[PDB]
Write a structure and sequence with these properties.
The protein is an alpha+beta fold and 191 residues long. Helix content is 21%, strand content 33%. The strands form three sheets. Strands 7, 8, 9, 10, 11 and 12 form a six-stranded antiparallel β-sheet that branches. Strand 8 and strand 9 form a beta hairpin. The radius of gyration is 17 Å and the shape is elongated. It comes from Homo sapiens. This is Syntenin-1.
């Protein structure tokens, strides 16, 4: 989670999509969903990102509907966006033990308990937090099994990006869980 603004230039695909859905939160605009294999995924927009401007114009106070509206009504040539990096999220680094544990319990993405003497404990991982990413990979909507798998497949060092459930639950609100499982980009970034 970078402590700054950045600018991205987008470019509508063949079909005029950018692969993005936006949600209005506390009078800003935030990324609800990034589609795999989209301009938005390529330029590296992330779930939880804040859109400050689109094509120079400020986003504050906009409705989800109007933000979508704007995106359609724009000379796709290039769309310029100004992005505060996942403002509602923070990242914990952790280390696996001899028995390959970081030391917490989660359910539906949400962390429900921390284990005594764990690395989860030493680093102050918090409960009532929905898991957003792991080692830089968005794991939202995956099953608990596949999340467990990623934590298993991951090295000893494990980096998790978490968000307060209340905020998480308000971002994903009005989006079907299948779409998150299906369409939300769950891939490592390209170089």
């Amino acid at each position: 989670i970078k402590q700054g603004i950045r600018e991205v230039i987008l470019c509508k695909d063949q079909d005029g999509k950018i692969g993005l859905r936006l949600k209005s939160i506390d009078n800003g605009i935030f990324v609800q969903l990034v589609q795999a294999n989209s301009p938005a995924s390529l330029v590296g927009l992330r779930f939880g990102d804040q859109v400050l401007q689109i094509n120079g114009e400020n986003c504050a106070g906009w409705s989800s509907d109007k933000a979508h509206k704007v995106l359609k009504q724009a000379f796709g040539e290039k769309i310029t966006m100004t992005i505060r990096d996942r403002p509602f999220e923070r990242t914990i680094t952790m280390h696996k033990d001899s028995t390959g544990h970081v030391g917490f319990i989660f359910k539906n993405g949400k962390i429900t308990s921390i284990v005594k003497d764990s690395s989860a404990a030493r680093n102050g991982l918090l409960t009532e937090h929905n898991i957003c990413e792991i080692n830089g990979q968005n794991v939202i909507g995956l099953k608990d099994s596949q999340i467990a798998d990623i934590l298993s497949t991951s090295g000893t060092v494990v980096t998790i990006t978490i968000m307060p459930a209340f905020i998480f639950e308000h971002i994903i609100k009005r989006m079907a869980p299948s779409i998150m499982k299906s369409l939300m980009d769950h891939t490592i970034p390209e170089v």
